[PDB]
Amino acid sequence: MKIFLDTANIDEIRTGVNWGIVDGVTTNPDLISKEAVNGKKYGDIIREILKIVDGPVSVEVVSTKYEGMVEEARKIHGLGDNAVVKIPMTEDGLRAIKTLSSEHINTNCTLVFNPIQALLAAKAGVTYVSPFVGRLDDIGEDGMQIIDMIRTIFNNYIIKTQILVASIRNPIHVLRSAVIGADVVTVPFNVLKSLMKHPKTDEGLAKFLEDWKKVSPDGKLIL
Amino acid sequence: MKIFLDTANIDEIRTGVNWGIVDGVTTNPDLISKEAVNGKKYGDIIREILKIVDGPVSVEVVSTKYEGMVEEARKIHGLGDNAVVKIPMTEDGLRAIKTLSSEHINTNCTLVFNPIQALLAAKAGVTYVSPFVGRLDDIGEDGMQIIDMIRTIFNNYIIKTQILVASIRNPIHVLRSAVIGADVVTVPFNVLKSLMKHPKTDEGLAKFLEDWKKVSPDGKLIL
Amino acid sequence: MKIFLDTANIDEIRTGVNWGIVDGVTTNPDLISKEAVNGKKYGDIIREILKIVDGPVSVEVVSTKYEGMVEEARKIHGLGDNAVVKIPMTEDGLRAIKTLSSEHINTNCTLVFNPIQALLAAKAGVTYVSPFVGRLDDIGEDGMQIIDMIRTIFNNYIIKTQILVASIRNPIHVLRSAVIGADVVTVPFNVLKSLMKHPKTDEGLAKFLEDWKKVSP
Amino acid sequence: MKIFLDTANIDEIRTGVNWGIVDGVTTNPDLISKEAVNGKKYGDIIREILKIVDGPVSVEVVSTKYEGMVEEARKIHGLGDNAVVKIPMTEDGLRAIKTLSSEHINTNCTLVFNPIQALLAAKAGVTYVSPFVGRLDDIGEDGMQIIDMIRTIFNNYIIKTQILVASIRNPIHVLRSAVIGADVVTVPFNVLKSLMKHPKTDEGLAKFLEDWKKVSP
Amino acid sequence: MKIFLDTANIDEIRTGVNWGIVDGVTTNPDLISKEAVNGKKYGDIIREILKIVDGPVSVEVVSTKYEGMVEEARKIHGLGDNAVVKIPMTEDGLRAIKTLSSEHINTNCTLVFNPIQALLAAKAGVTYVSPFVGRLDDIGEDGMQIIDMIRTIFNNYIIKTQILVASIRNPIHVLRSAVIGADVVTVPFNVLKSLMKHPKTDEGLAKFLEDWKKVSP
Amino acid sequence: MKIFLDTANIDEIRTGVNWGIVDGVTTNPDLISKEAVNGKKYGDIIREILKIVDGPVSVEVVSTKYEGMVEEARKIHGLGDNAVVKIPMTEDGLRAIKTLSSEHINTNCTLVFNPIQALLAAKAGVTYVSPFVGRLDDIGEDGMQIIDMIRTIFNNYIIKTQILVASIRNPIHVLRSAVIGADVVTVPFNVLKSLMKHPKTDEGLAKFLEDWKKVSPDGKLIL
Amino acid sequence: MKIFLDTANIDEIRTGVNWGIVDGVTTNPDLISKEAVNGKKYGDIIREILKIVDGPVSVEVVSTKYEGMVEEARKIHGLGDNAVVKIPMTEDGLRAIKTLSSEHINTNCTLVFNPIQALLAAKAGVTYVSPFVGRLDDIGEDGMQIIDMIRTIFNNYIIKTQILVASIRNPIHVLRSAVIGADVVTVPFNVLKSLMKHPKTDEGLAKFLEDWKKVSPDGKLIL
Amino acid sequence: MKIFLDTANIDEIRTGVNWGIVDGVTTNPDLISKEAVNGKKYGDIIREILKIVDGPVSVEVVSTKYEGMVEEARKIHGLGDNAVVKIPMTEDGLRAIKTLSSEHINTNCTLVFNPIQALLAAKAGVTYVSPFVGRLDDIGEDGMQIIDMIRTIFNNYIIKTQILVASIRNPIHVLRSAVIGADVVTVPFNVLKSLMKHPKTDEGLAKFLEDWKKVSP
Ligand SMILES: *C(CO)[C@@H](O)[C@H](O)[C@H](O)COP(=O)(O)O
Ligand SMILES: *C(CO)[C@@H](O)[C@H](O)[C@H](O)COP(=O)(O)O
Ligand SMILES: *C(CO)[C@@H](O)[C@H](O)[C@H](O)COP(=O)(O)O
Ligand SMILES: *C(CO)[C@@H](O)[C@H](O)[C@H](O)COP(=O)(O)O
Ligand SMILES: *C(CO)[C@@H](O)[C@H](O)[C@H](O)COP(=O)(O)O
Ligand SMILES: *[C@@H](CO)[C@@H](O)[C@H](O)[C@H](O)COP(=O)(O)O
Ligand SMILES: *[C@@H](CO)[C@@H](O)[C@H](O)[C@H](O)COP(=O)(O)O
Ligand SMILES: *[C@@H](CO)[C@@H](O)[C@H](O)[C@H](O)COP(=O)(O)O
């Protein structure tokens, strides 16, 4: 399972990349606009993320009509070969995904909330499809059940579109995604950092170090 | 399923190896301090086990910082080709695993307590991951369910990291591990001895011997 | 299922209570210390919540010893009959719960993270037990499975302690609690506000509003 | 399971009551406005249905504020003892439901799309709750799963609110409601008539008729 | 589980009655028109079955219209108190069942092929409902599934209508009906006789016969 | 669950009754004819069993026609109120069961091999129905699945006939009967005696007695 | 679920009782010999536990013969009304249970290893039955599955004998027993202590205390 | 699935082999000492079975020490290429299996009673592992569940050791072994003879025999 960072915060991306467990980044207009304050411009933010992140960086078009989406997608593509164009699940979005797929421009269909939307995006040739599990949880349906159905549908037809679980809110979205077999999760920084932690890891590490000081006063391992 | 001995008692290790039922050994700072009493040095104990044991021997770093871990890891690797460097599940541990994996040094990520920690260790390139089922049992959650989820996750992504079940306390941890399909169990010596035994084996042996006396008084097979 | 509000924010409690969907309130030392700022005193906050909320109001002791816990629990009980004394799952806490239960002081055992702790709290006679599902989610275990096991255990032994699901983070903790059959959930205000809402409710209301205007401008 | 007709068409209602399988009627602003054409007024339509149907007749308020909903509800109730006041799942609607339930005015909470909304309506005291299965099917989720969850939740807490499955589109919504154990379904007239029919019933009747002409010309 | 005989053949009925394991009889116009040949009249056959069979005996109307069905049902009722009037699953049939139930005339709704038809018949007050499993088998659907669903639905609503499994073709229809918990099965005579038999019963008798000859010639 | 002894051997019955876990006895013409040798007559055997066993004793008619079965059943009944008349699943047997049931003579329908035979016997009013699990096993169908279906059928209709599992061959027929909820098992003596035994009981008892001799040399418990 | 302490250590028993979490005690000849060292008499140890403990106290006979068992049982009963006589699963044990049950002496049948032994002990009238789950684990079969079958069997026949799960080794034996619905668990002291504890309880307590210092420096609740 | 005959009775083996359904033979010291009576020597019995049976023939060592086991195993191997050396699951036995497997002497590990013993035997390289299902039945555990777990374990690790189900007591051990997918069953002669037979086979043959006589006396 690939793990992407769901943020436009440079310091978070830099930190998570330096950890070696971040395989790419997803952004959206809200995440970018949060960082586009105090003089910083959204063009600088996107270019700096593309520089820091070896893997896929998903950047969302703001146009809602087919022609503007394709024009924006080509400019996004030109920023670097690791850019992925994020396109909403709409009639014009599906037309744009089909056009861009023929041009070998990688795409990510967003604002997906049920399995048949995800299948339509795959049929248009999309590289990644992003169902939003947290926003389904918000309205009282367990969002992970949609990931499970999409995994089954995609397995049935040997679909090559990657499932990119998005709107992730807690580490059990991540656990269940991995047990289902989703291709990618994208997670806020607070979630990513919690994934490495467990109270019994901290307890056990401290205990081992104290056990060791009984045979090595300096605490070193000399061999 | 490979079976490792979880001990640094040299007498136990020799006895287990000579049954031919032991495929490797795991140690940790506690286990080694137990045997480093009354003049025996921890360096001597580690070197001896590496000599006696033909399979992998897992030896744990004691530094908590990345540089200290890679430095100690390279020294452990230099003691023998069967040495495996045991590295805790932490931010610096994951960084150390990725670097060492690139240097073709085998690694074992320890103090793992849930399936996503195990997945992160696999993503860093670790040779073995060791979830601690007995310490989960201690805090009232069935540790074998974590092994089951890790096996499913690893199957989903064709992950090559081996599942090394650790903190084993009884033969049912071993039985359930084999049914799940974990790659390795590491067991204390008293658990190892119990695995060969059953009261109906003992009874049946005794009976066949008495039956054979009716046809051969000396109890031999003359062919 | 009862729905409690997990906050000491008096403005949140007033709003939730005016909606009529809030059956009680839980607090803890963090929640209260979030409000007791810029002059406000914690004793005044607790008394104000006790006044606003008709239903149970949980207030946590701060002492860690049996004697201090019982003395604090008695002062809490005396602030109002709807007060419930929140007591951590410790050896001294179980002793305190047993004493307070014999004195007919209602109790709530908190910081519970597996089903056997919840059973011990019930054996001490506690009125409510609060397993923390979000903090279990945090450490990579589905916290709702612990609620499922506690419900089965309590059903097996006809236990009268109420399961009060706490550390709730989202509306699916609430849905799963109701399908399991937990007695109570306690929810932060953001979660409480989402429980009434659905986008098809909003859409359908707008549509019926336009439909009606055709026969009644 | 009770079976209500989901229409304001007086001819459909008369026909269906004349069959003996119609236990009540539901309406909404769309359904009434469809028949309030060619000089016919909505007040007369509602009154006519109330007279023809012995069972419950659900009539929706159009106000969106608490005070207007309660005032409308009391007028709807005055029209006849079998009137049930249909109220949307909103903050003001839950407030109106609690007030009306204390006045012993029967209520039906509408525009429900998940199980926790249904639980909130039952906590307010509503007589019926109407989850909309067809509109969930429309957005790609199997609406009958929501009914199954509500049935479990209501069984867990011995809830007396009746589950009134609404937005029914086909006979399998009806079959699945009965197997789940929903209290009521409300169905459009074309669904209702299809429920009595099966091709082997038709085939069997024709053969037995031909069989009987053998021994009785 | 009650066991009825599905025939109009007086000799089969007499034989199965002598066995003590036949609780009642069902007939239909095909079955009767098979026995009213070579001078035998259908009115004699019906009275003769009524006379032989202590338990319920179902006799089907031939009218298709409400008033004719009700008139015929009263004539069938007058023939003996154990007569049960078999009425098809149609609009007029449901109307007649309701009227006849109000007159305390027992009824059996026939030509039922899915669970919702069975539910409608129960709602009209019918004493027995007869789904036709063999004819469903004929068209490629496992007819016993329909029995399972009707059992679940009737349990859900504490329905007092008895499930009378009809169109039975083999002993596994009978086994499955009993495992589901259907109230009654009605069986053709060939099927009935087969239910008592098993080759290991035959073999064991013969061997005990030889065994006892070693001890008592 | 009641446990009956399936034998006509006086010494076995006496032994099992003295153990206090035998609630009655079933016989059949073969079992009796095995004991009716060396001068003993079958009438003496039956009367002696009826004397030893407080509970139900099932004795099989040898006639195959209705009138002879009822006449034999009345003579069997006259031997003692604890006698139960065993009658085969045949057309005449069912007629006899119905007649005897009206006369308040207890009955046991035997040679039952499927669930609908068992239901017909219950409808005739039989006190016990005896499906033969071992003889089904012999012909390649798992005989316990018939007990499970009979239990379900009888539960469905609140049938008061007791399920008396017969033709029992091993202790797992007995275990599965108890887990299903059959009313009675009838077991050969060899099976009954094995039911109390387990190798870990013997091992544990011996170990406890040796532990005790460390604090009480005589091996007694003085209080 | 009642919780008994499986020990004869008086200090453990006093400590456990004073937590109010201990409902009774079980002993056996081994456990008592452990505490009957350096002058302490086994009779004194038994009498003291009976004094300290308000709930049942199970004390095991050492005679293997029926007469010896009933004689010792009556003496054990005379020491206090809370005494329960522990009797092994044997032919003579079952006879002793039936006699003692008729004398209204409470009994506990021990060394049970499968569900039919447990059923036989219930048929003899035993107050408690003790299947040994840890010793089953030792010989490679999951002991908790035996508890599950016994609970089903007892439910089937409305058996009043209480299931007393014994040979408990870890907190998951306890968790699974409660989920199954066993009447009683008896646990060693180190397992008892572990049941109250969890690392997130410890962490959360520590955090609330630090949070409270921001509003109250002395860490008290002034009401 | 291979079917072996579990006996040293030469008459049983000849009969089973003449039927063509016997793929091999297992013996043990009890079975052989049952035959070596009234002058007959055990060495002659083993040699005669090796001659009659084309397939594998298992013969158990009697020594309990590694050195004696290997020396006995080598003499057994030299009696014929179809000989397989049966070795008990003990520490010395596992050592002997490992040595003999490296010498390409086929082995069978016996007295196995749980799935981890079977796994250890496979890790030592044993050709066949023989779990004892009837002796587990004797002590109140369903022995076939152990076969099910061993099959799953062996599938998990692509283990090439063959599962040889032993201590078989009835044809349902055989049926369940085949449904699980065990490689081999070894059966006593009484069981072997029952596997071909069914009363409906006997009945149908008699019936076709009579049917044919109508067209061919
Ligand atoms: C190394 C990881 O494979 C092992 O030595 C582990 O440290 C132990 O198995 C942990 O066991 P304990 O919980 O008994 O320390
Ligand atoms: C009291 C027990 O119901 C509550 O106030 C709990 O302390 C909180 O629900 C725990 O929540 P957090 O994990 O968010 O502190
Ligand atoms: C009356 C309803 O119970 C019965 O006589 C039915 O007509 C028959 O069981 C139907 O059987 P066929 O499909 O064989 O006509
Ligand atoms: C009495 C029966 O309830 C108990 O004392 C048992 O003897 C022990 O629980 C057995 O445990 P061990 O297997 O550890 O001896
Ligand atoms: C050898 C291993 O396959 C066999 O001869 C076994 O020893 C027997 O199958 C065991 O049977 P018993 O339990 O009847 O001795
Ligand atoms: C792009 C799709 O992969 C992501 O940035 C999504 O916009 C977010 O993950 C949505 O999360 P929120 O629901 O929290 O906005
Ligand atoms: C009232 C609630 O029982 C009903 O009239 C509902 O408004 C309808 O059943 C909704 O159906 P549509 O989705 O077709 O509007
Ligand atoms: C009477 C019915 O309870 C019993 O004696 C049965 O005849 C036997 O149990 C049948 O056993 P076999 O199949 O071994 O004869």
> Do the Cβ atoms of B90 and A205 come closer than 8 Å?
yes
Give exposure, D95-112, as e/b (b: 16+ Cβ within 10 Å): bbbbbbeeeebbbbbbbb
**Encoded tokens for B5:** 């001995």
> Do the Cβ atoms of G82 and G108 come closer than 8 Å?
no
Ligand having the closest approach to the CA of A57:
6
First-last CA distance in chain F: 37
Q: Is B6 in the pocket of ligand 1 (CB under 6 A)?
A: yes
Cβ atoms within 10 Å, residue A8: 25
Q: What gap in Å lies between CA D56 and CA D23, rounded to an integer?
A: 7
Q: What gap in Å lies between CA D33 and CA D27, rounded to an integer?
A: 10
Q: Among H49, H68, H67, H48, which Cα is nearest to H58's?
A: H49
Give catalytic residues of G, as residue numbers.
86
Give 3-state DSSP helix, strand, coil % of chain H, rounded to 5. 55, 20, 30
Structure obtained using: X-ray
**Angstroms from B190 CA to nearest CA on chain F:** 19
Phi first, then psi: give them for residue D185, nearest 5 degrees: -120, 145
Partner-chain residue, chosen from D29, D95, D152, that has the shortest CB–CB distance to C212: D29
Where helices occur in G19-90 by DSSP H, the ranges are: 29-35, 42-52, 66-78
Output the residue whose Cα is nearest ligand 8's atom 10: F167
Element (H, E) at G102: helix G91-102
Element (H, E) at C164: strand C162-165
Distance of CA B22 to the CA centre of its chain: 9
| F109, F114, F120, F122 alpha-carbon torsion, rounded to 10° | 60
**Chain H meets chain A (3+ C-beta pairs below 8 A):** no
For chain B, the DSSP string reads -EEEEE---HHHHHHHHHTT---EEE--HHHHHHH--TT--HHHHHHHHHHH-SS-EEEE----SHHHHHHHHHHHHHT-TTEEEEEESSHHHHHHHHHHHHTT--EEEEEE-SHHHHHHHHHTT-SEEEEBHHHHHHTTS-THHHHHHHHHHHHHHT--SEEEEBS--SHHHHHHHHHHT-SEEEE-HHHHHHHT--HHHHHHHHHHHHHHHTT-TT-----
Phi first, then psi: give them for residue A58, nearest 5 degrees: -95, 125
Q: What gap in Å lies between CA G215 and CA E56, rounded to an integer?
A: 83
Distance of CA G149 to the CA centre of its chain: 19
The structure tokens 């897992």 sit at: B58
What is the H135 CA–ligand 5 centroid distance (Å)?
9
Cα separation values, C6 from A88, C31, C110, C168, C189, Å: 37, 8, 13, 9, 7
> Do the Cβ atoms of E195 and E188 come closer than 8 Å?
no
Q: Among H107, H110, H154, which Cα is nearest to H132's?
A: H110
Q: What gap in Å lies between CA B111 and CA B130, rounded to an integer?
A: 7
Element (H, E) at F120: helix F115-123
Q: What gap in Å lies between CA E23 and CA E11, rounded to an integer?
A: 16
Q: What gap in Å lies between CA C124 and CA C130, rounded to an integer?
A: 14
Q: What gap in Å lies between CA B119 and CA D143, rounded to an integer?
A: 36
Cα separation values, E119 from D13, D172, E73, E94, E156, Å: 20, 14, 22, 11, 11
> Do the Cβ atoms of E84 and E100 come closer than 8 Å?
no
User: Mapping DSSP to helix (H, G, I), strand (E, B) and coil, where does residue H144 land?
Assistant: helix
Q: Among G99, G110, G61, which Cα is nearest to G83's?
A: G61
Contacts for B59 with CB less than 8 Å, ≥ 6 apart? B27, B46, B76, B83, B84, B85, B86
Catalytic residue among F41, F86, F200, F214: F86
Contacts for D173 with CB less than 8 Å, ≥ 6 apart? D133, D134, D143, D144, D165, D185
> Do the Cβ atoms of F112 and F135 come closer than 8 Å?
no
What is the D82 CA–ligand 3 centroid distance (Å)?
42
Q: Among H89, H115, B140, which Cα is nearest to G141's?
A: H115
Contacts for H174 with CB less than 8 Å, ≥ 6 apart? H3, H168, H185, H187, H191, H195
Phi first, then psi: give them for residue F88, nearest 5 degrees: -75, 155
Atom number in ligand 5 closest to CA H58: 1
Catalytic residue among H86, H123, H207, H213: H86
Phi first, then psi: give them for residue E21, nearest 5 degrees: -130, 10
Atom number in ligand 1 closest to CA B60: 1
Ramachandran area for residue C181 (φ above 0: left; ψ -120 to 50: alpha; else beta)? left
Strand partners for B57:
B25, B83
Chain G from 157 to 186: CB within 8 A of any C CB: 171, 174-175, 178-181
Contacts for G70 with CB less than 8 Å, ≥ 6 apart? G96, G99, G100
Cα separation values, F17 from F20, F86, F193, G196, Å: 5, 21, 12, 48
> Do the Cβ atoms of D26 and D58 come closer than 8 Å?
yes
User: Mapping DSSP to helix (H, G, I), strand (E, B) and coil, where does residue C46 land?
Assistant: helix
For E10-43, the DSSP string reads HHHHHHHHHHT----EE--HHHHHHHS-TT--HH
**G114 and chain H in contact, CB less than 8 A:** yes
Contacts for E202 with CB less than 8 Å, ≥ 6 apart? none
Q: What gap in Å lies between CA A196 and CA A180, rounded to an integer?
A: 20
Q: What gap in Å lies between CA C28 and CA G211, rounded to an integer?
A: 10
Q: Among H51, H50, H68, H5, which Cα is nearest to H31's?
A: H5
What is the number of alpha carbons within 13 Å of residue B202 lying toward its C-beta?
Answer: 10
Breaks (C-N over 2.5 A) in chain E follow: none
Q: Among G118, G119, G123, which Cα is nearest to G97's?
A: G123
Q: Among D33, D75, D80, D30, which Cα is nearest to D56's?
A: D80
The length of chain G is 223
**Encoded tokens for A104:** 């070998």
CB contact under 8 Å between E33 and D211, yes or no, is yes
Element (H, E) at E94: helix E91-102
Q: What is the DSSP letter of F185?
A: E
Ligand having the closest approach to the CA of B128:
1
The structure tokens 């009282």 sit at: A140
Strand partners for G24:
G4
Q: What gap in Å lies between CA B131 and CA B4, rounded to an integer?
A: 14
CB contact under 8 Å between D211 and E114, yes or no, is no
Which residues constitute the domain of residue A68?
1-223
> Do the Cβ atoms of D123 and C21 come closer than 8 Å?
yes
**Encoded tokens for B48:** 């001896």
CB contact under 8 Å between H200 and E203, yes or no, is no
Please say whether the dihedral angle defined by the alpha carbons of residues G93, G95, G97 and G103, taken in this order, is positive or negative. Answer: negative
For H39-107, the DSSP string reads T--HHHHHHHHHHH-SS-EEEE----SHHHHHHHHHHHHTT-TTEEEEEESSHHHHHHHHHHHHTT--E
Query: Nearest-5° angle of CA F154, CA F159, CA F165?
Result: 55
Helix H, strand E, coil C: the string for chain D is: CEEEEECCCHHHHHHHHCCCCCCEEECCHHHHHHHCCCCCCHHHHHHHHHHHCCCCEEEECCCCCHHHHHHHHHHHHHCCCCEEEEEECCHHHHHHHHHHHHCCCCEEEEEECCHHHHHHHHHCCCCEEEEEHHHHHHCCCCHHHHHHHHHHHHHHCCCCCEEEEECCCCHHHHHHHHHHCCCEEEECHHHHHHHCCCHHHHHHHHHHHHHHHHHCC
CB contact under 8 Å between C98 and G20, yes or no, is yes
**Encoded tokens for H74:** 């080598």
Where helices occur in chain C by DSSP H, the ranges are: 10-19, 29-35, 42-52, 66-77, 91-102, 115-123, 133-138, 144-156, 171-180, 189-195, 199-215
Comparing alpha-carbon positions, the chain B residue that sits nearest to H150 is: B179
User: Mapping DSSP to helix (H, G, I), strand (E, B) and coil, where does residue C142 land?
Assistant: coil
Q: Which of E5, E13, E25, E26 to mutate to test the pocket of ligand 3 (most atoms within 8 A of CB)?
A: E26
Ligand having the closest approach to the CA of H134:
5
> Do the Cβ atoms of G42 and G70 come closer than 8 Å?
no
Chain A positions touching G200 (Cβ under 8 A) are 199
Element (H, E) at H113: none
Output the residue whose Cα is nearest ligand 5's atom 10: H167
Q: What is the DSSP letter of H28?
A: -
- Protein residues whose CB sits closer than 6 Å to any atom of ligand 6: A 6, 26-28, 58, 86, 108, 110, 130, 132, 134-135, 164, 166-167, 186
Q: What gap in Å lies between CA A118 and CA A104, rounded to an integer?
A: 20
Query: Nearest-5° angle of CA E134, CA E136, CA E138?
Result: 70
Please say whether the dihedral angle defined by the alpha carbons of residues C50, C55, C56 and C57, taken in this order, is positive or negative. Answer: negative
**Angstroms from D114 CA to nearest CA on chain A:** 6
Q: What's at C47, amino acid-wise?
A: R
Q: What gap in Å lies between CA F166 and CA G107, rounded to an integer?
A: 32
Distance of CA F157 to the CA centre of its chain: 24
For B145-206, the DSSP string reads HHHHHHHHHHHHHT--SEEEEBS--SHHHHHHHHHHT-SEEEE-HHHHHHHT--HHHHHHHH
CB contact under 8 Å between C29 and G223, yes or no, is no
What is the E130 CA–ligand 3 centroid distance (Å)?
8
> Do the Cβ atoms of B187 and B5 come closer than 8 Å?
yes
Atom number in ligand 2 closest to CA C27: 5
Cα separation values, E63 from C131, E72, E98, Å: 67, 8, 16
The helix-helix angle for D115-123 and D91-102 (nearest 10°) equals 40
Phi first, then psi: give them for residue C78, nearest 5 degrees: -75, -5
For testing contact with chain B, the best of A200, A216, A222 (most B CBs within 10 A): A200
Q: What's at E44, amino acid-wise?
A: D
Please say whether the dihedral angle defined by the alpha carbons of residues G19, G24, G30 and G32, taken in this order, is positive or negative. Answer: positive
Interface chains of chain H (3 or more CB pairs under 8 Å) = B, E, F, G
Report the relative pairing of strands F184-187 and G2-6 from DSSP bridges: unpaired
Chain H from 184 to 213: CB within 8 A of any E CB: 199-200, 203
Q: What's at H97, amino acid-wise?
A: I
> Do the Cβ atoms of H140 and G116 come closer than 8 Å?
yes
Resolution of this deposited model, Å: 1.6
Output the residue whose Cα is nearest ligand 6's atom 5: A27
Q: What is the DSSP letter of F143?
A: T
For testing contact with chain E, the best of F32, F156, F157, F158 (most E CBs within 10 A): F156
- Number of structural domains, chain H? 1
What is the H165 CA–ligand 5 centroid distance (Å)?
9
Comparing alpha-carbon positions, the chain H residue that sits nearest to F191 is: H138
Give exposure, B124-149, as e/b (b: 16+ Cβ within 10 Å): bbbbbbbbbbbbbbbbbbbbbbbbbb
The length of chain F is 223
**Encoded tokens for D67:** 């005070």
Q: H helices then E strands: how many in chain A?
A: 11, 8
Report the relative pairing of strands G184-187 and D184-187 from DSSP bridges: unpaired
Report the relative pairing of strands H24-26 and H2-6 from DSSP bridges: parallel
> Do the Cβ atoms of H61 and H84 come closer than 8 Å?
no
Give catalytic residues of A, as residue numbers.
86
Partner-chain residue, chosen from C90, C116, C124, that has the shortest CB–CB distance to G178: C116
CB contact under 8 Å between C94 and G21, yes or no, is yes
Interface chains of chain F (3 or more CB pairs under 8 Å) = B, E, G, H
Strand partners for F5:
F25, F187
Q: What is the DSSP letter of F82?
A: T
Chain G positions touching A201 (Cβ under 8 A) are none
Strand partners for B87:
B109
> Do the Cβ atoms of A211 and B31 come closer than 8 Å?
no
Q: Among A213, D80, A141, which Cα is nearest to C197's?
A: A141
Catalytic residue among C86, C98, C160, C207: C86
Q: Is B110 in the pocket of ligand 1 (CB under 6 A)?
A: yes
**Encoded tokens for B216:** 């051969």
**Encoded tokens for B219:** 């109890």
Burial of C107 (0-12, 13-18, 19+ CB in 10 A): buried
The structure tokens 């530094």 sit at: B63
Partner-chain residue, chosen from G3, G18, G215, that has the shortest CB–CB distance to C33: G215
Cβ atoms within 10 Å, residue A55: 15
Q: Which of B3, B117, B186, B190 to mutate to test the pocket of ligand 1 (most atoms within 8 A of CB)?
A: B186
**Encoded tokens for C83:** 């007060």
**Angstroms from G220 CA to nearest CA on chain H:** 57
Q: What gap in Å lies between CA B177 and CA B146, rounded to an integer?
A: 11
Atom number in ligand 2 closest to CA C28: 5
User: Mapping DSSP to helix (H, G, I), strand (E, B) and coil, where does residue F63 land?
Assistant: coil
Cα separation values, E203 from F60, F113, F138, Å: 16, 12, 13
Q: What gap in Å lies between CA H182 and CA H168, rounded to an integer?
A: 13
**Chain D meets chain H (3+ C-beta pairs below 8 A):** no
Q: What gap in Å lies between CA B91 and CA A18, rounded to an integer?
A: 10
